[PDB]
Amino acid sequence: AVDTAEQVYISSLALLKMLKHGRAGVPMEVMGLMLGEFVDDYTVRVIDVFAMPQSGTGVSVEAVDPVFQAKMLDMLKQTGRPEMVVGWYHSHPGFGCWLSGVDINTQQSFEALSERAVAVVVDPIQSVKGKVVIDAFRLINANMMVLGHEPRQTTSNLGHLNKPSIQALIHGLNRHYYSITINYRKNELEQKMLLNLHKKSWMEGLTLQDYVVKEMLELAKNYNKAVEEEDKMTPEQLAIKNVGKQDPKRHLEEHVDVLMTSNIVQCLAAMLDTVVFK
Amino acid sequence: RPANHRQLTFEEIAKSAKITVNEVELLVMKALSVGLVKGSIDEVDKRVHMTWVQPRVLDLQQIKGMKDRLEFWCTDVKSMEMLVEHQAHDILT
Amino acid sequence: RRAAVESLGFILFRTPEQCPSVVSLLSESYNPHVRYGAAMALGICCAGTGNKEAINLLEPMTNDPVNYVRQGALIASALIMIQQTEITCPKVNQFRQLYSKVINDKHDDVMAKFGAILAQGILDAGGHNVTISLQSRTGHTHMPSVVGVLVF
Amino acid sequence: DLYSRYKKLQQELEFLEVQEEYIKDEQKNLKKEFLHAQEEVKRIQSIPLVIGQFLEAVDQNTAIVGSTTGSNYYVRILSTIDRELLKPNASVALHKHSNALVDVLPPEA
Amino acid sequence: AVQKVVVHPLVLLSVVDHFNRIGKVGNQKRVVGVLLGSWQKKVLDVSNSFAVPFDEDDKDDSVWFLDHDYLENMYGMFKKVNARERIVGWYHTGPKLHKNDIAINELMKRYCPNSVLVIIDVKPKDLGLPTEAYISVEEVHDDGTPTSKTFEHVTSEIGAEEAEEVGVEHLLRDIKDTTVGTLSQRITNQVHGLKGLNSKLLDIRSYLEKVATGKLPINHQIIYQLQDVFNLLPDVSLQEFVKAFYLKTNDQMVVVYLASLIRSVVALHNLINNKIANRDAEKKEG
Amino acid sequence: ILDKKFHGILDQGEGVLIIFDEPPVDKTYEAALETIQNMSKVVDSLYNKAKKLT
Amino acid sequence: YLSKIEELQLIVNDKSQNLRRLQAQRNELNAKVRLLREELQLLQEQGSYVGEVVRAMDKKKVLVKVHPEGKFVVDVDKNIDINDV
Ligand SMILES: [Zn+2]
């Protein structure tokens, strides 16, 4: 029918299960499923993503056992709330992305079975805390080729989705595909608590247990002599003449902030007796 | 004894210990070898030095030590932590 | 943030003659939001000005790397050039042929050339007969020229 | 006009003193942003780097690099490495996807 | 046995999502679930958990329901997709312990001998630490009853794993690692001082409440026995570190001479670069 | 003790003749050696500073 | 005659303006420092392959032999002439 920009709200559990399931899916490109809710055409929130067992033949739709689904989701029937399987995912866990043939194996199968049927491409490599490395698309019919493929009613998100200058094989396969927007929805109760448990765990010291104070200053006066003489030897050879030559080699000597922050640490940790004591 | 006297005399040892003035060195060195206290005694003047020890309760249900040291220390480091905050008021900025 | 750099001409159009000096580095932010709202801020702010500093600063905004800020910068060029005639600033026909450059070629950005002819129409509203009016002779501001443009 | 000029000089002053505070805050912000730039880019470290060879630099930081896969490539190198460590050559450290020059291995000696 | 763990917040969102399952439909208002654990070392490790459909009634407070197909063959499907992950314990909400805890302890020990349950919170705005860990041993008592399976506590902690914050820390954006010297330690100062001496105010308050009407900690005499470990320092009426008089003098000595010398050299860094760079780029008028 | 040394200061009334010193203190030495030439640089720059103005 | 010369005194005010303008310039400095650091995604890409061009042929293409591999008739970029190949 008519087309309007589809939005993938993700559950953050889905983000965790993708990273974990592809992390365990070490090179061997695992398959799993997507289990969600039909809200409309132009959005989808996924609420649950669980695991599918490893098959060593070939990443296929024929490895999807439907009675495995029946039994697993049967256990999940009274457990919380079940919904429709709305898709699937495969993995390319070392390199970024491309539009696989596994897509054109199972995508026609799950667009026969389900309606939205979103393909999902994943990688864990490109960062550890600050990127969106997963990728997702959807197969286009051949029958819409009479229509020119340029309507879109809200072109901010296609002005944000075309905007990253799509990389290699996606627009190697612009045909048989059309892209889809994946934001991270409002997950603030988890966001604040992982912020807490990141600068409370993933940065050392559980704050009762920081207040190294002295042997670090033995090593730091080693620093504040060894760094110092090299801070001395160099700017003797600055432009002490009247030359108009303009070609620098750049080394940016300065060494200030090490001294500064380390010795603020040294003074306020020498404070620890008069601070924690009385 | 209500400490801040830990390096001390010997006649209270030779009085409460029902021992003599001479036999306090056997006393302290054998008591260090036992293992209930581990402080090396200032032996030149028979001056005691002590460490970790095993308690038998304080004032009748631990009123006085608990209050005047524990809560006094509570408001000490608590209020001077508020003073740390007071001078460190906007150094977080 | 985009709404914050959109409210500026909405609250300060009685004095449009400060907006360049205050949205200058705002035009060089990190996101499409503040850059886009910056172009729109100089647009909805300096409407009746014969400023041309706003034009000169929209020049690297209409040659920006982000696509729809080039779109919105064509639209901001429409915003500056109305309540302005040809001789108020010599780049009016330059922007007419510049719209023509960007839209009548195919190889430029489609999303960023959408604004060009719509901006020509803004520029030839009645053939410069009609134009926008935030400020009357009475001083009574006009509800389309506040409400409709903020929704717009 | 000494009631209205003296009115509005104050007004434009208080305006610009507000407007200073924006850029004061952004100067507070962007130093943190540049530090995040520094370390979160310099996590480009030894993801298990491969040994190769260095042949040509067309200019500053754009290499032509041989590998122990044998072939020769054409990448760029970082803004970090000193330019007098590759002076005919080095045992070089290369990334995999980015495949760029990272480090100089210790020579055989 | 169990001493310390390695726990990754995938279990935490696996608590919060079943909290989303039973929150809006809230009738028994509790998230109780099973903690799968990749038991590797004496240090424990978790990368998976699931929440059982479960209730717990108040009257006689020992009525409770697992789902042993969801407990056995779901675990079997999990063992097929991951045999490294196996059972190690469970978890629940409602941090007030109760009487059914020992019953699900009786059943959790037959799956794993050194099992450990997890008291959670659904909204930690804490000091803080995350969720809890126990250890179930039998010490019976000084009382002579049949076997007392009283919950002893394992000191809980948190580990880490590669590539598990990729979008989340990207979404928060408020990450500030290198700023220790203004804020990151004064937070700890406020925290351990105020929050430790107010837990100590709960100590004096709770134990003086035991003085008034309570246990009055006899027969757990480790309470005041360990307040003696506090009472390493008695601080009697002159605060008694006049033997540390010269020692604190010699401590102030080193760092303040470092301060004087080093910060004079820090001035010698700052001023010369500032003056030369400014005078050059200022007198270049064009 | 006079001509040669092993840095034994005359400790007449102790009973050890304690032989002690801390030879690495040379952070302070090295900073002094810095200052001596740092302001040789500054004084050499002062010619430019008081020359190119007036 | 108080309300004449206060206006003049409002140029002490204007000293904040110069400092404002110049720290705005200071921010403008870091703006392309951060843009230089944002540029580094181009470093994060797979660069290229070497190739032995034996000889070009008609109709705006060349031949390329890759370093261990066979020969490959390939296409050119917009920036290069076969007169220079
Ligand atoms: Zn794949």
PDB file of all heavy atoms in Angstrom, chain A residues 155 158-160 163, chain C residues 33 66-68 111:
ATOM      1  N   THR A 155      10.707  13.082   6.288  1.00  0.00           N
ATOM      2  CA  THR A 155      12.038  12.865   5.752  1.00  0.00           C
ATOM      3  C   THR A 155      13.135  13.405   6.681  1.00  0.00           C
ATOM      4  O   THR A 155      14.280  13.585   6.253  1.00  0.00           O
ATOM      5  CB  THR A 155      12.105  13.466   4.344  1.00  0.00           C
ATOM      6  OG1 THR A 155      10.841  13.263   3.716  1.00  0.00           O
ATOM      7  CG2 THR A 155      13.066  12.689   3.461  1.00  0.00           C
ATOM      8  N   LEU A 158      14.758   9.835   7.297  1.00  0.00           N
ATOM      9  CA  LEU A 158      15.557   9.457   6.144  1.00  0.00           C
ATOM     10  C   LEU A 158      16.683  10.440   5.885  1.00  0.00           C
ATOM     11  O   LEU A 158      17.715  10.046   5.333  1.00  0.00           O
ATOM     12  CB  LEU A 158      14.684   9.294   4.898  1.00  0.00           C
ATOM     13  CG  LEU A 158      14.228   7.850   4.651  1.00  0.00           C
ATOM     14  CD1 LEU A 158      13.235   7.328   5.688  1.00  0.00           C
ATOM     15  CD2 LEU A 158      13.666   7.717   3.240  1.00  0.00           C
ATOM     16  N   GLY A 159      16.539  11.684   6.340  1.00  0.00           N
ATOM     17  CA  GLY A 159      17.656  12.608   6.406  1.00  0.00           C
ATOM     18  C   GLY A 159      18.616  12.360   7.544  1.00  0.00           C
ATOM     19  O   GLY A 159      19.597  13.094   7.686  1.00  0.00           O
ATOM     20  N   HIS A 160      18.315  11.376   8.389  1.00  0.00           N
ATOM     21  CA  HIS A 160      19.219  10.897   9.419  1.00  0.00           C
ATOM     22  C   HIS A 160      19.733   9.496   9.144  1.00  0.00           C
ATOM     23  O   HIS A 160      20.762   9.113   9.706  1.00  0.00           O
ATOM     24  CB  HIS A 160      18.516  10.900  10.783  1.00  0.00           C
ATOM     25  CG  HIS A 160      18.128  12.261  11.260  1.00  0.00           C
ATOM     26  ND1 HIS A 160      17.247  12.462  12.299  1.00  0.00           N
ATOM     27  CD2 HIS A 160      18.497  13.492  10.836  1.00  0.00           C
ATOM     28  CE1 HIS A 160      17.088  13.758  12.494  1.00  0.00           C
ATOM     29  NE2 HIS A 160      17.837  14.405  11.620  1.00  0.00           N
ATOM     30  N   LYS A 163      21.792   9.791   5.929  1.00  0.00           N
ATOM     31  CA  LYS A 163      22.876  10.686   6.338  1.00  0.00           C
ATOM     32  C   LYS A 163      24.225  10.026   6.642  1.00  0.00           C
ATOM     33  O   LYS A 163      25.250  10.606   6.241  1.00  0.00           O
ATOM     34  CB  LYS A 163      22.407  11.520   7.540  1.00  0.00           C
ATOM     35  CG  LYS A 163      23.379  12.594   7.939  1.00  0.00           C
ATOM     36  CD  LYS A 163      23.535  13.573   6.792  1.00  0.00           C
ATOM     37  CE  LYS A 163      24.487  14.688   7.143  1.00  0.00           C
ATOM     38  NZ  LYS A 163      25.904  14.252   7.283  1.00  0.00           N
TER      39      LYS A 163
ATOM     40  N   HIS C  33      20.870  19.572  14.469  1.00  0.00           N
ATOM     41  CA  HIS C  33      19.816  20.298  15.173  1.00  0.00           C
ATOM     42  C   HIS C  33      20.204  21.747  15.429  1.00  0.00           C
ATOM     43  O   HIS C  33      19.462  22.663  15.066  1.00  0.00           O
ATOM     44  CB  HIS C  33      19.481  19.596  16.487  1.00  0.00           C
ATOM     45  CG  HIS C  33      18.723  18.319  16.317  1.00  0.00           C
ATOM     46  ND1 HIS C  33      19.335  17.126  15.995  1.00  0.00           N
ATOM     47  CD2 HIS C  33      17.409  18.036  16.475  1.00  0.00           C
ATOM     48  CE1 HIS C  33      18.426  16.169  15.938  1.00  0.00           C
ATOM     49  NE2 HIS C  33      17.249  16.695  16.225  1.00  0.00           N
ATOM     50  N   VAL C  66      26.244  18.841   5.880  1.00  0.00           N
ATOM     51  CA  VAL C  66      24.979  18.173   6.187  1.00  0.00           C
ATOM     52  C   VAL C  66      23.940  18.574   5.148  1.00  0.00           C
ATOM     53  O   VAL C  66      23.875  19.732   4.726  1.00  0.00           O
ATOM     54  CB  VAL C  66      24.536  18.506   7.627  1.00  0.00           C
ATOM     55  CG1 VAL C  66      23.127  18.005   7.951  1.00  0.00           C
ATOM     56  CG2 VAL C  66      25.537  17.960   8.630  1.00  0.00           C
ATOM     57  N   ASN C  67      23.144  17.602   4.700  1.00  0.00           N
ATOM     58  CA  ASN C  67      22.263  17.824   3.560  1.00  0.00           C
ATOM     59  C   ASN C  67      21.069  18.703   3.919  1.00  0.00           C
ATOM     60  O   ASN C  67      20.854  19.763   3.311  1.00  0.00           O
ATOM     61  CB  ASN C  67      21.832  16.471   2.981  1.00  0.00           C
ATOM     62  CG  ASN C  67      21.352  15.505   4.044  1.00  0.00           C
ATOM     63  OD1 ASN C  67      21.251  15.859   5.217  1.00  0.00           O
ATOM     64  ND2 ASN C  67      21.060  14.278   3.638  1.00  0.00           N
ATOM     65  N   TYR C  68      20.272  18.296   4.905  1.00  0.00           N
ATOM     66  CA  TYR C  68      19.055  19.066   5.091  1.00  0.00           C
ATOM     67  C   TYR C  68      19.297  20.363   5.840  1.00  0.00           C
ATOM     68  O   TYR C  68      18.403  21.208   5.860  1.00  0.00           O
ATOM     69  CB  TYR C  68      17.954  18.232   5.755  1.00  0.00           C
ATOM     70  CG  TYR C  68      18.142  17.804   7.187  1.00  0.00           C
ATOM     71  CD1 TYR C  68      17.637  18.575   8.227  1.00  0.00           C
ATOM     72  CD2 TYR C  68      18.755  16.600   7.499  1.00  0.00           C
ATOM     73  CE1 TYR C  68      17.763  18.185   9.535  1.00  0.00           C
ATOM     74  CE2 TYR C  68      18.891  16.198   8.814  1.00  0.00           C
ATOM     75  CZ  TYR C  68      18.392  17.000   9.825  1.00  0.00           C
ATOM     76  OH  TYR C  68      18.513  16.623  11.141  1.00  0.00           O
ATOM     77  N   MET C 111      17.128  16.068  -1.312  1.00  0.00           N
ATOM     78  CA  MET C 111      16.608  16.604  -0.064  1.00  0.00           C
ATOM     79  C   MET C 111      17.120  18.013   0.185  1.00  0.00           C
ATOM     80  O   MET C 111      16.413  18.834   0.775  1.00  0.00           O
ATOM     81  CB  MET C 111      17.014  15.690   1.086  1.00  0.00           C
ATOM     82  CG  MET C 111      16.316  15.960   2.389  1.00  0.00           C
ATOM     83  SD  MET C 111      17.017  14.898   3.647  1.00  0.00           S
ATOM     84  CE  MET C 111      16.609  13.306   2.953  1.00  0.00           C
TER      85      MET C 111
END
